């Protein structure tokens, strides 16, 4: 299909952007802004915790993951309340889960406050992961083109 352009991505993510059905596996404090191994260790811990909770009749919270030029919003599906919101410049790393095509996570937070948000997607995680890659790329592209033209 047609290759992406900056303008296509700007229109896709402006305003309310796009949203995906998911469940929140958990949130974990982590030591660094980025890293595959750090993220997977966090994913495994949070999945272990969710499995223990499941054995006690707990369920993961049903959410929308909203992706836009404003960053990522975690929205409670039942009530529609925004439970978590991180702007683009406070999201540091996107992690895939090699064990699970329906999970991914992201590291976010300012310095000394890095946290891993682990997400179980309703469908495959890859389209969401790619949307995040594209979101960050178009914002970076637009910034760089502005900088090159002013110099």
């Amino acid at each position: 299909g047609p290759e992406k352009t900056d303008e296509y991505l700007l229109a896709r993510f402006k305003g309310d952007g796009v949203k995906y059905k998911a469940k929140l596996i958990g949130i974990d404090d982590v030591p660094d802004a980025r890293g595959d191994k750090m993220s997977q260790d966090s994913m495994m811990k949070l999945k272990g915790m969710a499995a223990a909770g499941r054995s006690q009749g707990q369920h993961k919270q049903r959410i929308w993951v909203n992706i836009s030029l404003s960053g990522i919003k975690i929205i409670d599906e039942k009530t529609g309340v925004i439970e978590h919101e991180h702007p683009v410049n406070k999201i540091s790393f996107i992690a895939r889960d090699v064990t699970d095509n329906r999970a991914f996570g992201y590291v976010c937070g300012g310095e000394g406050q890095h946290q891993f948000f682990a997400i179980k997607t309703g469908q495959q995680a890859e389209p969401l992961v790619v949307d995040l890659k594209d979101l960050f790329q178009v914002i970076y592209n637009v910034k760089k083109k502005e900088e090159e033209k002013k110099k």
């Binding site: 595959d36 406070k90 540091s92 890659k133």
Partner: peptide, 13 residues
């Protein structure tokens, strides 16, 4: 297969 950095990330608040 791996993850990726956000080049727009700014740690300081």
């Amino acid at each position: 297969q791996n993850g990726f950095d956000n080049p727009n990330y700014q740690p300081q608040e």
